[PDB]
Every structure is written in structure tokens, then in C-alpha cells.
Design a protein around this ligand. Structure first.
Ligand SMILES: Cc1cn([C@H]2C[C@H](OP(=O)(O)O)[C@@H](COP(=O)(O)O)O2)c(=O)[nH]c1=O
Ligand SMILES: [Ca+2]
Length: 129
């Protein structure tokens, strides 16, 4: 897997970000995770967390997996890094996302994310409290 440059256009919610990628605006949906919708409990904290993370970052990168790069809505499917920290993992580690939407072929970082979910659950953080 490889990291590619992109630039923040707009934070959207906990697990969707608008980024400019190869000079085109695209909506990017985070692989392997599900944040609450803004209207649900922890949804605002998940949107807030992703927002800070991507807005504070000096360098945003996207990393596609081995499988589909777009979903059926035309959204990118990817891992996002904020100054080398994976957003997908960080949300799960804080108990602001669950591991979800694990489809074979786009699941390189599954174990890593499950490990973080385990430690979040252990600490009873946020969604696990
Ligand atoms: C994360 C992810 C979501 N999706 C689709 C499945 C879901 O379809 P349905 O909309 O038909 O339920 C939807 C969930 O996205 P959100 O959690 O953003 O709503 O996005 C994929 O197809 N592949 C993926 O890797
Ligand atoms: Ca969601």
C-alpha cells in the first residue's frame, strides 16, 4: 500500500472528508470504520475529532487498499493520515468509531484497527462507556 498526497477541502463528519486528490475534489469515506451520524450520540464528538485532526495536520495523505477505490455513491475508499497518524485508527482508539464495513480485498489494516478497538473498549472510552 502507498501514501498519496491530498489537501483538505472540508471536514464533513466523523468518517467522511472532502479532499482534493490529483487536482479533483472528491468525497473520501474512511475504510474499515463507522462513526455515529452527527445527530446520534458521540456523532458530534466524532466529527469534532476528525475535523481537528485533519485541519491541524500539516500533511494529509490518502492510502488506497487493494480493492475498490470508489463506493456505489462515487465516494473514495481509503485510509487517511494526518502528519503520519492514521485517522481511521485514531478514531477507533478513542472509542469514537467502530470497526465496520470489512470487505475482503479492502482490509489491509483490519487487525491494527481491531487492536485499537480492544484497547478503547478496555478503557470504556466514549462509545464503550
Ligand atoms: C466504508 C464503506 C461503505 N460502503 C457503503 C456501504 C453502505 O451502503 P448503504 O448506504 O447502502 O447502507 C454505505 C455506508 O456509508 P456511511 O456509513 O457513510 O453511511 O457506504 C461501501 O460500499 N464500502 C465501504 O468500504
Ligand atoms: Ca457513518
Amino acid at each position: 500500500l502507498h501514501k498519496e498526497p491530498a489537501t483538505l477541502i472540508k471536514a464533513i463528519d466523523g468518517d467522511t472528508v472532502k479532499l482534493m486528490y490529483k487536482g479533483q475534489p472528491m468525497t473520501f469515506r474512511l475504510l474499515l470504520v463507522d462513526t455515529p451520524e452527527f445527530n446520534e450520540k458521540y456523532g458530534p464528538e466524532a466529527s469534532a475529532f476528525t475535523k481537528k485532526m485533519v485541519e491541524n495536520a500539516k500533511k494529509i495523505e490518502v492510502e488506497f487498499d487493494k480493492g475498490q477505490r470508489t463506493d456505489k455513491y462515487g465516494r473514495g475508499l481509503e485510509y487517511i493520515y494526518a502528519d503520519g497518524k492514521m485517522v481511521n485508527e485514531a478514531l477507533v482508539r478513542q472509542g469514537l468509531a467502530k470497526v465496520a464495513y470489512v470487505y475482503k480485498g479492502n482490509n489491509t489494516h483490519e487487525q491494527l484497527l481491531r487492536k485499537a478497538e480492544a484497547q478503547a473498549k478496555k478503557e470504556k472510552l466514549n462509545i464503550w462507556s
